[PDB]
Amino acid sequence: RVQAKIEIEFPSEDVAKVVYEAVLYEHLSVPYRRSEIDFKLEGKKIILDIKATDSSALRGTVNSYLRWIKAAIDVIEV
Amino acid sequence: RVQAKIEIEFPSEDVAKVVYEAVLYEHLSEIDFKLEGKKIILDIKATDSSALRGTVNSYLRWIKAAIDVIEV
Amino acid sequence: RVQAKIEIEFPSEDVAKVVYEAVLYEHLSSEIDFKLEGKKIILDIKATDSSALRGTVNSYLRWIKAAIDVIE
Amino acid sequence: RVQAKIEIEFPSEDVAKVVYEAVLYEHLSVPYRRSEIDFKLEGKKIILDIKATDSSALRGTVNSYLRWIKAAIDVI
Amino acid sequence: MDPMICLGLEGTAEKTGVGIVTSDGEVLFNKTIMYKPNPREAADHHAETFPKLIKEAFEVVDKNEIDLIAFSQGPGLGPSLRVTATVARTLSLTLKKPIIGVNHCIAHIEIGKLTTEAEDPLTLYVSGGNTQVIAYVSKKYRVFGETLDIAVGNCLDQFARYVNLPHPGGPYIEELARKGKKLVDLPYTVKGMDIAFSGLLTAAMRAYDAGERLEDICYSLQEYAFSMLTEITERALAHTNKGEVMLVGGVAANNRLREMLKAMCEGQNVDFYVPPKEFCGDNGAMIAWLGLLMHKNGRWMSLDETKIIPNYRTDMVEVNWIK
Amino acid sequence: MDPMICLGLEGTAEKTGVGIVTSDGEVLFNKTIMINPREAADHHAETFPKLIKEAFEVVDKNEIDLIAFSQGPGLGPSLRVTATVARTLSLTLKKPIIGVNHCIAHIEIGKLTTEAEDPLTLYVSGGNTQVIAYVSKKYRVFGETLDIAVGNCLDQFARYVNLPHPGGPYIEELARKGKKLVDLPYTVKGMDIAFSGLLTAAMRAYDAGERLEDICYSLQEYAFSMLTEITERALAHTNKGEVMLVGGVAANNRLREMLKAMCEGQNVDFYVPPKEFCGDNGAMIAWLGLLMHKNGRWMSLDETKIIPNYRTDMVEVNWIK
Numbered sequence: 002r003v004q005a006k007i008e009i010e011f012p013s014e015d016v017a018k019v020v021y022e023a024v025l026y027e028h029l030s031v032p033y034r035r036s037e038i039d040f041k042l043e044g045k046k047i048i049l050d051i052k053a054t055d056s057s058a059l060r061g062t063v064n065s066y067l068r069w070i071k072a073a074i075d076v077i078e079v
Numbered sequence: 080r081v082q083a084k085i086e087i088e089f090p091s092e093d094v095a096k097v098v099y100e101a102v103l104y105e106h107l108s109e110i111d112f113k114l115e116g117k118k119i120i121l122d123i124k125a126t127d128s129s130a131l132r133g134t135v136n137s138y139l140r141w142i143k144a145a146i147d148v149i150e151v
Numbered sequence: 152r153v154q155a156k157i158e159i160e161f162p163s164e165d166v167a168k169v170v171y172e173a174v175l176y177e178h179l180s181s182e183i184d185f186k187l188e189g190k191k192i193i194l195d196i197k198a199t200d201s202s203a204l205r206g207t208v209n210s211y212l213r214w215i216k217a218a219i220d221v222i223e
Numbered sequence: 224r225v226q227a228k229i230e231i232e233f234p235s236e237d238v239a240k241v242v243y244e245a246v247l248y249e250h251l252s253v254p255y256r257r258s259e260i261d262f263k264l265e266g267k268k269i270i271l272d273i274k275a276t277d278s279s280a281l282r283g284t285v286n287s288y289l290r291w292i293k294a295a296i297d298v299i
Numbered sequence: 300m301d302p303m304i305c306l307g308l309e310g311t312a313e314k315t316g317v318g319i320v321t322s323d324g325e326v327l328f329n330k331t332i333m334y335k336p337n338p339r340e341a342a343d344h345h346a347e348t349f350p351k352l353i354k355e356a357f358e359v360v361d362k363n364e365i366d367l368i369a370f371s372q373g374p375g376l377g378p379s380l381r382v383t384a385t386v387a388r389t390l391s392l393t394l395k396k397p398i399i400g401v402n403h404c405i406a407h408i409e410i411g412k413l414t415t416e417a418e419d420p421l422t423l424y425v426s427g428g429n430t431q432v433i434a435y436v437s438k439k440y441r442v443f444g445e446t447l448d449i450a451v452g453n454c455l456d457q458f459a460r461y462v463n464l465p466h467p468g469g470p471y472i473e474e475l476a477r478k479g480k481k482l483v484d485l486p487y488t489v490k491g492m493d494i495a496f497s498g499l500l501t502a503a504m505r506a507y508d509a510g511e512r513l514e515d516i517c518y519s520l521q522e523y524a525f526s527m528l529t530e531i532t533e534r535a536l537a538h539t540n541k542g543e544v545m546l547v548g549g550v551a552a553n554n555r556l557r558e559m560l561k562a563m564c565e566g567q568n569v570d571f572y573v574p575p576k577e578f579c580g581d582n583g584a585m586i587a588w589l590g591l592l593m594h595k596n597g598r599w600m601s602l603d604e605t606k607i608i609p610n611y612r613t614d615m616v617e618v619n620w621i622k
Numbered sequence: 623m624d625p626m627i628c629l630g631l632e633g634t635a636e637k638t639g640v641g642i643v644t645s646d647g648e649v650l651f652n653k654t655i656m657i658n659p660r661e662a663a664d665h666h667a668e669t670f671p672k673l674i675k676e677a678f679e680v681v682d683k684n685e686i687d688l689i690a691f692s693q694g695p696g697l698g699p700s701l702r703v704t705a706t707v708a709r710t711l712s713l714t715l716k717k718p719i720i721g722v723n724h725c726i727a728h729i730e731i732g733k734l735t736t737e738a739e740d741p742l743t744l745y746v747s748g749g750n751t752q753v754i755a756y757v758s759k760k761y762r763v764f765g766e767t768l769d770i771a772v773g774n775c776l777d778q779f780a781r782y783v784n785l786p787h788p789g790g791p792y793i794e795e796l797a798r799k800g801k802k803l804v805d806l807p808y809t810v811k812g813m814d815i816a817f818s819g820l821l822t823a824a825m826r827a828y829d830a831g832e833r834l835e836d837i838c839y840s841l842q843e844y845a846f847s848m849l850t851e852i853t854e855r856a857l858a859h860t861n862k863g864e865v866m867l868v869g870g871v872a873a874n875n876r877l878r879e880m881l882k883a884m885c886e887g888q889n890v891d892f893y894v895p896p897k898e899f900c901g902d903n904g905a906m907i908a909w910l911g912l913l914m915h916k917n918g919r920w921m922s923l924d925e926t927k928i929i930p931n932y933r934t935d936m937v938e939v940n941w942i943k
């Protein structure tokens with residue numbers, strides 16, 4: 002299989018919570034997933050533990066989750 | 080910053096070498112791309128999440144292309 | 152503006168008169184219009200605020216109640 | 224037997240709705256009434272159509288509602 | 300005593316939109332950006348455009364005076380709706396203000412009733428991805444007639460990129476249609492109050508392969524499609540006993556469609572309304588208004604009620620703002 | 623970034639209270655103002671606007687993000703004034719509103735400002751006497767009073783021997799000088815207590831001619847022992863490691879003495895909140911409303927109707943795990 006572990010650290014602990022909480026509901030809004038994902042928050046960083054079947058399956062979920070996180074962060078600033 | 084670690088297991092250690100060499104040689108954020116046994120390790124460290132997503136997309140695209148040649 | 156209009160019907164026209172005269176005469180000091188029309192007693196009150204209106208309504212409804220309680 | 228009509232006008236139409244909505248839920252929070260009450264909003268004024276048995280029953284209901292309305296206004 | 304201000308987020312289709320309206324009919328801010336060519340790529344476009352549009356919105360109105368945040372919850376594309384939703388509650392958590400999930404199709408109708416004389420109209424929703432007849436009947440907004448297969452807006456796009464025309468093919472087909480002046484034999488498909496454009500489209504491009512002039516086909520494709528649209532609107536209008544007819548969606552920009560429907564309306568003694576050009580297509584202003592409409596009349600939803608609804612049905616809402 | 627600021631409104635029973643706390647433990651504002659339920663409601667209607675005005679001088683009204691109020695349990699007409707005032711602000715300030723349980727607010731303000739984490743709380747109020755612990759995913763009443771509350775029992779006895787209405791403190795003072803207990807009924811049934819039987823006999827001893835100081839001493843001995851007993855038993859039923867004393871009667875030094883002695887004996891901790899947070903206050907309502915909302919609870923106006931008999935297990939705890 003193909004596994005990945007992504008970590009995204011934030012300036013403040015409060016900022017980490019805001020992004021995490023916003024994205025969290027999209028993490029539960031997935032009925033059918035292309036790969037198994039664990040979306041957790043540890044301190045000032047958001048942990049993203051993904052385990053997939055193939056490389057193409059991993060790319061789809063990483064693109065999706067990092068998109069949501071990108072959208073969340075870009076909003077808090079400015 | 081923002082860090083990532085991807086591991087890809089292959090049927091044989093020889094297959095891992097073929098894919099590893101194929102991506103490394105045909106494609107010339109901070110990246111660590113090494114080969115450990117039958118697995119290919121990918122340690123990526125970027126500035127922001129968008130930068131990490133771009134480089135991850137690139138490597139996973141190349142690795143995908145390499146395997147598609149081997150498999151039929 | 153806070154306005155109020157209360158009507159109290161009585162069994163006989165004489166009963167209305169007794170109550171009307173009893174309340175009017177035994178309580179002499181918001182704008183108030185206190186009249187008797189037939190078998191019913193009309194009470195037109197005009198006050199500045201709600202607390203002032205509540206105070207005067209409490210006073211009159213107490214007196215009217217007291218007047219009837221004597222007859223019965 | 225005993226009827227009443229209370230009207231409370233407000234400076235603006237916006238204030239009338241605010242007071243009205245705050246009181247409205249207390250108008251529906253009453254299981255047992257001392258008198259039948261109609262609590263509606265017409266423009267900038269709040270209408271109160273009350274029909275009671277005796278004067279004492281009307282007094283209880285007016286004090287209750289006017290307390291709520293007064294409390295609402297006193298906050299704004 | 301001050302009016303409540305809502306921030307609207309539109310991100311279901313290709314168009315990213317941000318709007319700011321008050322409790323009254325005043326629209327403080329409204330701007331929409333399109334995407335010139337895929338659901339995955341469209342979602343990425345929203346993720347890039349939304350932060351940029353908000354900067355411009357926060358320059359017109361300071362972020363502190365925003366009391367409500369509304370977003371298009373659906374229906375629409377999966378990945379696109381998620382970006383919109385995530386951005387919506389990201390703001391909601393930051394500004395510490397309430398959030399409201401808004402149905403896209405009704406937002407089109409309600410922004411029309413605000414900017415047109417429509418009180419209780421029968422609305423014809425004609426979008427790039429939608430073709431429905433919606434009216435408010437029996438305490439809910441209901442679809443009395445709608446499209447099978449694809450939408451006419453989609454039908455015009457798909458035909459355009461077939462004959463090598465720019466992606467927003469709708470307007471370009473209309474221009475070419477005037478020069479045509481010859482009707483082509485095409486299938487007229489109407490079932491009750493429902494229509495189908497799949498049969499019409501395939502035959503239209505087959506006539507293109509046949510060698511019949513493109514100007515004639517564009518003319519013919521419009522005449523057939525809009526007539527079928529006019530018919531089901533007429534049937535639904537009589538079925539619902541409404542006194543008004545509304546035309547919303549991007550295809551409302553079509554001059555011929557307006558002509559055909561307005562003529563039908565004048566015949567049955569009913570009024571015909573079309574919103575301003577800015578409010579016909581997808582926009583953030585209409586989402587802000589409907590979110591404001593629902594919340595001011597007493598609808599609160601928590602974050603767990605803000606998950607995306609890709610197939611949001613019109614009758615799944617509860618209309619609490621209609622007297 | 624910045625913390626969320628909530629405005630709390632306490633208007634259960636006789637005490638009017640207004641509080642302002644942040645997302646953190648910081649308390650920005652807290653003030654309380656001191657029978658007929660009908661007249662008490664009128665008192666709230668007069669006092670609440672003054673305190674809220676006073677509160678807006680410390681913290682700008684624009685910086686208020688949440689409005690919490692004591693939804694119950696409590697007196698009918700009093701709860702209505704609080705609620706109406708609460709949502710009047712909610713509509714005015716255009717901010718969310720949260721209905722807060724009174725009894726739990728006492729506990730949660732207790733876990734704050736003390737080292738209490740998961741305690742067994744002894745609620746001793748003027749209208750309440752309960753033993754509440756968080757067990758099986760809900761806050762539950764394991765033991766409570768039949769008839770009236772002990773806080774009420776001291777008041778009813780005080781105004782019987784011609785003492786001021788807040789009789790609690792005055793009985794405690796007189797209790798010190800007495801120093802001999804009079805034979806009174808010790809009424810405890812299972813995990814429940816009854817003070818109605820204790821009260822009638824206490825006033826019987828007053829008519830008999832025994833010194834009121836002596837009676838006050840004896841009334842305290844019996845009442846506080848009965849309270850201490852069901853607390854110890856409940857402690858075993860819930861297997862907790864802490865014991866909390868909340869309510870207005872928590873100001874009683876003798877009651878504190880008995881419970882800390884009991885706790886030191888059973889190897890468990892004993893906590894009592896600061897004097898300002900023991901009795902009814904607006905600060906505790908603000909915190910619990912903040913506690914619920916911060917963990918993701920929103921309620922509309924139709925969920926903000928008064929609940930005169932609000933049960934402890936009728937809440938849904940989303941803030942503890």
Ligand SMILES: Nc1ncnc2c1ncn2[C@@H]1O[C@H](COP(=O)(O)O)[C@@H](O)[C@H]1O
Nearest residue numbers: 426427452469470549550552553580581
């Ligand atoms: N003048 C027009 N005639 C026909 N179709 C149009 C016209 N203008 C826009 N459209 C179509 O309307 C759709 C856009 O609608 P919307 O996504 O709701 O803004 C696209 O499919 C366009 O091709």
Ligand SMILES: Nc1ncnc2c1ncn2[C@@H]1O[C@H](COP(=O)(O)O)[C@@H](O)[C@H]1O
Nearest residue numbers: 747748773790791870871873874901902
């Ligand atoms: N020092 C005290 N000792 C005993 N009871 C008290 C004391 N202070 C207040 N109380 C009682 O607490 C009740 C009022 O507090 P609360 O229940 O918080 O409103 C009344 O029953 C008072 O008699």
Ligand SMILES: [Mg+2]
Nearest residue numbers: 426548580581
């Ligand atoms: Mg649309």
Ligand SMILES: [Mg+2]
Nearest residue numbers: 747869901902
């Ligand atoms: Mg208390």
